[PDB]
Structure 1
Amino acid sequence: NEIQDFPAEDVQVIVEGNEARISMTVYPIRSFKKISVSLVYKQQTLQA
């Protein structure tokens, strides 16, 4: 859990001569610093 997620498909490698070029995508790890929650009350009727 140092990173969140990453798509394996994006990992592409180009090799040419003495040079190696790599592309990737990574979703950075994050930490919660806000929680918003909504509550709703409702009536209920029970029978039998």
Structure 2
Amino acid sequence: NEIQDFPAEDVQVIVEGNEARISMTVYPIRSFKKISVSLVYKQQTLQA
């Protein structure tokens, strides 16, 4: 859990001569610093 997620497909490698080029995508780790929660009350009737 140092990173959130990453798609394996995006890991592409180009090799040519003495040079190696690599592309990737990573979803950075994050930490919660806000919580918003909504509550709703409702009537109920029970029978039998």
* Identical aligned residues as a percent: 100
Structure 1 portions without partners, runs of 5+: none
Task: Note the alpha carbon deviations across 1:8-30, whole angstroms, 9 max, x for none.
Answer: 00000000000000000000000
Name whichever structure is richer in strand by fraction: 1
**Aligned residue-pair number:** 48
Q: Normalization by structure 1: what TM-score? A: 1.00
SS at match of 2:47: coil
Shift of 1:32: 0.0
Output the aligned Cα RMSD: 0.0
- Which 4+ residue blocks in structure 1 deviate beyond 2 angstroms? none
Structure 2 portions without partners, runs of 5+: none
1:2 aligned residue: 2
